[PDB]
Amino acid sequence: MSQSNRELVVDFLSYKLSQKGYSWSQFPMAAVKQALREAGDEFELRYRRAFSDLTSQLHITPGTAYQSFEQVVNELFRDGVNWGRIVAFFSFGGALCVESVDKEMQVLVSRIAAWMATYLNDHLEPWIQENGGWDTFVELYG
């Protein structure tokens, strides 16, 4: 999970940046990654606001600390965790990275990736592991 999740986060963020015309140079596993990439595209297809409100609540700068990131991300889970909210969490991180590149703060991309892995391992893996693990995610979104 530690390294697994780190790799999962980097893959999704790299996918999103590539897809959107940005560089990703600031950085069954294969089945998990693919399922998550598609899940995110489906999610963003419906919700296209890009978490403007949440990103505004965060207004990320090189000075922003994890605790602030954690506090804002917690908003997605006020009613607890579920697969859709985990997908939204990945999408939110992608949105934060795109925003960071648009502001010429590409230095933040690897930082956001680290923050996401930390948050995933700390707050989301408990629920994930209790509900089938990533195997169930693939089975549900693959």
Side-chain angles (χ1 to χ4, degrees), residues 72-89:
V72 177
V73 173
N74 277 174
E75 304 283 54
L76 295 177
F77 304 100
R78 58 163 152 56
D79 295 324
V81 181
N82 71 25
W83 299 117
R85 260 104 76 160
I86 284 165
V87 171
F89 155 82

PDB file of all heavy atoms in Angstrom, residues 72-89:
ATOM      1  N   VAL A  72      -9.161  20.488   3.722  1.00  0.00           N
ATOM      2  CA  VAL A  72     -10.047  20.715   2.589  1.00  0.00           C
ATOM      3  C   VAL A  72     -10.537  19.386   1.999  1.00  0.00           C
ATOM      4  O   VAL A  72     -11.722  19.235   1.679  1.00  0.00           O
ATOM      5  CB  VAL A  72      -9.330  21.542   1.486  1.00  0.00           C
ATOM      6  CG1 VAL A  72     -10.243  21.718   0.276  1.00  0.00           C
ATOM      7  CG2 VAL A  72      -8.940  22.916   2.048  1.00  0.00           C
ATOM      8  N   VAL A  73      -9.626  18.429   1.845  1.00  0.00           N
ATOM      9  CA  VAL A  73      -9.998  17.131   1.290  1.00  0.00           C
ATOM     10  C   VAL A  73     -11.032  16.452   2.193  1.00  0.00           C
ATOM     11  O   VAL A  73     -11.916  15.740   1.712  1.00  0.00           O
ATOM     12  CB  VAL A  73      -8.747  16.217   1.116  1.00  0.00           C
ATOM     13  CG1 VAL A  73      -9.166  14.814   0.700  1.00  0.00           C
ATOM     14  CG2 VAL A  73      -7.815  16.822   0.066  1.00  0.00           C
ATOM     15  N   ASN A  74     -10.930  16.680   3.499  1.00  0.00           N
ATOM     16  CA  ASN A  74     -11.883  16.100   4.441  1.00  0.00           C
ATOM     17  C   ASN A  74     -13.321  16.453   4.032  1.00  0.00           C
ATOM     18  O   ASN A  74     -14.250  15.703   4.318  1.00  0.00           O
ATOM     19  CB  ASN A  74     -11.635  16.623   5.861  1.00  0.00           C
ATOM     20  CG  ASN A  74     -10.537  15.878   6.600  1.00  0.00           C
ATOM     21  OD1 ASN A  74     -10.163  16.277   7.713  1.00  0.00           O
ATOM     22  ND2 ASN A  74     -10.018  14.803   6.012  1.00  0.00           N
ATOM     23  N   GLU A  75     -13.505  17.592   3.367  1.00  0.00           N
ATOM     24  CA  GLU A  75     -14.835  18.023   2.932  1.00  0.00           C
ATOM     25  C   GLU A  75     -15.524  17.002   2.021  1.00  0.00           C
ATOM     26  O   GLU A  75     -16.748  16.879   2.037  1.00  0.00           O
ATOM     27  CB  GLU A  75     -14.750  19.366   2.194  1.00  0.00           C
ATOM     28  CG  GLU A  75     -14.089  20.480   2.980  1.00  0.00           C
ATOM     29  CD  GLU A  75     -14.988  21.075   4.045  1.00  0.00           C
ATOM     30  OE1 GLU A  75     -15.513  20.316   4.888  1.00  0.00           O
ATOM     31  OE2 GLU A  75     -15.163  22.315   4.040  1.00  0.00           O
ATOM     32  N   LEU A  76     -14.736  16.276   1.227  1.00  0.00           N
ATOM     33  CA  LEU A  76     -15.281  15.271   0.322  1.00  0.00           C
ATOM     34  C   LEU A  76     -15.823  14.079   1.103  1.00  0.00           C
ATOM     35  O   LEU A  76     -16.644  13.318   0.599  1.00  0.00           O
ATOM     36  CB  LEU A  76     -14.187  14.750  -0.620  1.00  0.00           C
ATOM     37  CG  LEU A  76     -13.565  15.732  -1.612  1.00  0.00           C
ATOM     38  CD1 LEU A  76     -12.457  15.038  -2.387  1.00  0.00           C
ATOM     39  CD2 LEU A  76     -14.631  16.249  -2.561  1.00  0.00           C
ATOM     40  N   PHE A  77     -15.349  13.922   2.333  1.00  0.00           N
ATOM     41  CA  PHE A  77     -15.725  12.785   3.155  1.00  0.00           C
ATOM     42  C   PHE A  77     -16.503  13.119   4.423  1.00  0.00           C
ATOM     43  O   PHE A  77     -16.389  12.407   5.427  1.00  0.00           O
ATOM     44  CB  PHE A  77     -14.460  12.013   3.522  1.00  0.00           C
ATOM     45  CG  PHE A  77     -13.658  11.566   2.324  1.00  0.00           C
ATOM     46  CD1 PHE A  77     -12.533  12.288   1.914  1.00  0.00           C
ATOM     47  CD2 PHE A  77     -14.059  10.464   1.575  1.00  0.00           C
ATOM     48  CE1 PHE A  77     -11.816  11.920   0.763  1.00  0.00           C
ATOM     49  CE2 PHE A  77     -13.357  10.076   0.420  1.00  0.00           C
ATOM     50  CZ  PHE A  77     -12.227  10.815   0.011  1.00  0.00           C
ATOM     51  N   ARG A  78     -17.294  14.184   4.384  1.00  0.00           N
ATOM     52  CA  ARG A  78     -18.069  14.566   5.557  1.00  0.00           C
ATOM     53  C   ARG A  78     -19.097  13.495   5.911  1.00  0.00           C
ATOM     54  O   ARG A  78     -19.531  13.406   7.063  1.00  0.00           O
ATOM     55  CB  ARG A  78     -18.766  15.913   5.349  1.00  0.00           C
ATOM     56  CG  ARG A  78     -19.688  15.969   4.157  1.00  0.00           C
ATOM     57  CD  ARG A  78     -20.644  17.157   4.252  1.00  0.00           C
ATOM     58  NE  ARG A  78     -21.058  17.631   2.930  1.00  0.00           N
ATOM     59  CZ  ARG A  78     -21.637  16.874   2.000  1.00  0.00           C
ATOM     60  NH1 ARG A  78     -21.884  15.592   2.237  1.00  0.00           N
ATOM     61  NH2 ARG A  78     -21.959  17.400   0.823  1.00  0.00           N
ATOM     62  N   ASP A  79     -19.492  12.690   4.924  1.00  0.00           N
ATOM     63  CA  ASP A  79     -20.446  11.612   5.161  1.00  0.00           C
ATOM     64  C   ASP A  79     -19.717  10.263   5.079  1.00  0.00           C
ATOM     65  O   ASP A  79     -20.325   9.216   4.859  1.00  0.00           O
ATOM     66  CB  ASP A  79     -21.598  11.666   4.138  1.00  0.00           C
ATOM     67  CG  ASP A  79     -22.461  12.939   4.277  1.00  0.00           C
ATOM     68  OD1 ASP A  79     -22.670  13.415   5.419  1.00  0.00           O
ATOM     69  OD2 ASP A  79     -22.946  13.465   3.249  1.00  0.00           O
ATOM     70  N   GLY A  80     -18.403  10.294   5.257  1.00  0.00           N
ATOM     71  CA  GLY A  80     -17.628   9.071   5.202  1.00  0.00           C
ATOM     72  C   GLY A  80     -17.124   8.756   3.800  1.00  0.00           C
ATOM     73  O   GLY A  80     -17.374   9.487   2.843  1.00  0.00           O
ATOM     74  N   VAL A  81     -16.424   7.641   3.689  1.00  0.00           N
ATOM     75  CA  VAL A  81     -15.841   7.193   2.432  1.00  0.00           C
ATOM     76  C   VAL A  81     -16.743   6.251   1.638  1.00  0.00           C
ATOM     77  O   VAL A  81     -17.554   5.529   2.205  1.00  0.00           O
ATOM     78  CB  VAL A  81     -14.520   6.417   2.703  1.00  0.00           C
ATOM     79  CG1 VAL A  81     -13.873   5.958   1.373  1.00  0.00           C
ATOM     80  CG2 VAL A  81     -13.546   7.292   3.513  1.00  0.00           C
ATOM     81  N   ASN A  82     -16.617   6.315   0.318  1.00  0.00           N
ATOM     82  CA  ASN A  82     -17.269   5.382  -0.598  1.00  0.00           C
ATOM     83  C   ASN A  82     -16.433   5.459  -1.873  1.00  0.00           C
ATOM     84  O   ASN A  82     -15.589   6.355  -2.002  1.00  0.00           O
ATOM     85  CB  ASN A  82     -18.789   5.629  -0.812  1.00  0.00           C
ATOM     86  CG  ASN A  82     -19.124   6.878  -1.620  1.00  0.00           C
ATOM     87  OD1 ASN A  82     -18.338   7.371  -2.433  1.00  0.00           O
ATOM     88  ND2 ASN A  82     -20.341   7.379  -1.406  1.00  0.00           N
ATOM     89  N   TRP A  83     -16.615   4.505  -2.780  1.00  0.00           N
ATOM     90  CA  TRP A  83     -15.819   4.470  -4.004  1.00  0.00           C
ATOM     91  C   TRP A  83     -15.894   5.746  -4.822  1.00  0.00           C
ATOM     92  O   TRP A  83     -14.872   6.224  -5.317  1.00  0.00           O
ATOM     93  CB  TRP A  83     -16.225   3.269  -4.871  1.00  0.00           C
ATOM     94  CG  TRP A  83     -16.002   1.943  -4.183  1.00  0.00           C
ATOM     95  CD1 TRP A  83     -16.960   1.028  -3.834  1.00  0.00           C
ATOM     96  CD2 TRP A  83     -14.753   1.395  -3.756  1.00  0.00           C
ATOM     97  NE1 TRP A  83     -16.382  -0.054  -3.217  1.00  0.00           N
ATOM     98  CE2 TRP A  83     -15.031   0.143  -3.153  1.00  0.00           C
ATOM     99  CE3 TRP A  83     -13.425   1.833  -3.821  1.00  0.00           C
ATOM    100  CZ2 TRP A  83     -14.029  -0.671  -2.622  1.00  0.00           C
ATOM    101  CZ3 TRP A  83     -12.427   1.021  -3.295  1.00  0.00           C
ATOM    102  CH2 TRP A  83     -12.736  -0.221  -2.702  1.00  0.00           C
ATOM    103  N   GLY A  84     -17.093   6.302  -4.952  1.00  0.00           N
ATOM    104  CA  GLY A  84     -17.251   7.526  -5.724  1.00  0.00           C
ATOM    105  C   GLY A  84     -16.473   8.707  -5.143  1.00  0.00           C
ATOM    106  O   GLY A  84     -15.923   9.521  -5.892  1.00  0.00           O
ATOM    107  N   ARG A  85     -16.436   8.803  -3.815  1.00  0.00           N
ATOM    108  CA  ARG A  85     -15.718   9.877  -3.139  1.00  0.00           C
ATOM    109  C   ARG A  85     -14.209   9.681  -3.257  1.00  0.00           C
ATOM    110  O   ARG A  85     -13.452  10.643  -3.270  1.00  0.00           O
ATOM    111  CB  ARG A  85     -16.147   9.959  -1.671  1.00  0.00           C
ATOM    112  CG  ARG A  85     -17.170  11.062  -1.431  1.00  0.00           C
ATOM    113  CD  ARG A  85     -18.586  10.597  -1.253  1.00  0.00           C
ATOM    114  NE  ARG A  85     -18.799  10.015   0.064  1.00  0.00           N
ATOM    115  CZ  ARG A  85     -19.983   9.857   0.656  1.00  0.00           C
ATOM    116  NH1 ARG A  85     -21.107  10.243   0.069  1.00  0.00           N
ATOM    117  NH2 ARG A  85     -20.044   9.273   1.839  1.00  0.00           N
ATOM    118  N   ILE A  86     -13.769   8.432  -3.340  1.00  0.00           N
ATOM    119  CA  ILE A  86     -12.343   8.154  -3.525  1.00  0.00           C
ATOM    120  C   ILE A  86     -11.961   8.606  -4.949  1.00  0.00           C
ATOM    121  O   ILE A  86     -10.900   9.205  -5.166  1.00  0.00           O
ATOM    122  CB  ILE A  86     -12.045   6.656  -3.346  1.00  0.00           C
ATOM    123  CG1 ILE A  86     -12.073   6.325  -1.849  1.00  0.00           C
ATOM    124  CG2 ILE A  86     -10.671   6.312  -3.913  1.00  0.00           C
ATOM    125  CD1 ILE A  86     -12.144   4.843  -1.524  1.00  0.00           C
ATOM    126  N   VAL A  87     -12.830   8.324  -5.915  1.00  0.00           N
ATOM    127  CA  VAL A  87     -12.576   8.743  -7.291  1.00  0.00           C
ATOM    128  C   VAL A  87     -12.545  10.281  -7.310  1.00  0.00           C
ATOM    129  O   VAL A  87     -11.654  10.888  -7.926  1.00  0.00           O
ATOM    130  CB  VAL A  87     -13.667   8.179  -8.262  1.00  0.00           C
ATOM    131  CG1 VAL A  87     -13.519   8.795  -9.671  1.00  0.00           C
ATOM    132  CG2 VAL A  87     -13.537   6.647  -8.351  1.00  0.00           C
ATOM    133  N   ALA A  88     -13.491  10.925  -6.621  1.00  0.00           N
ATOM    134  CA  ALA A  88     -13.504  12.393  -6.569  1.00  0.00           C
ATOM    135  C   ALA A  88     -12.195  12.930  -5.974  1.00  0.00           C
ATOM    136  O   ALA A  88     -11.688  13.942  -6.424  1.00  0.00           O
ATOM    137  CB  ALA A  88     -14.698  12.907  -5.748  1.00  0.00           C
ATOM    138  N   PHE A  89     -11.669  12.251  -4.961  1.00  0.00           N
ATOM    139  CA  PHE A  89     -10.405  12.630  -4.312  1.00  0.00           C
ATOM    140  C   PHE A  89      -9.265  12.606  -5.346  1.00  0.00           C
ATOM    141  O   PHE A  89      -8.455  13.532  -5.413  1.00  0.00           O
ATOM    142  CB  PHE A  89     -10.123  11.656  -3.151  1.00  0.00           C
ATOM    143  CG  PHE A  89      -8.665  11.528  -2.779  1.00  0.00           C
ATOM    144  CD1 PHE A  89      -8.051  12.464  -1.951  1.00  0.00           C
ATOM    145  CD2 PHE A  89      -7.917  10.444  -3.235  1.00  0.00           C
ATOM    146  CE1 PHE A  89      -6.707  12.315  -1.574  1.00  0.00           C
ATOM    147  CE2 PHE A  89      -6.573  10.283  -2.867  1.00  0.00           C
ATOM    148  CZ  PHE A  89      -5.967  11.224  -2.032  1.00  0.00           C
TER     149      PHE A  89
END
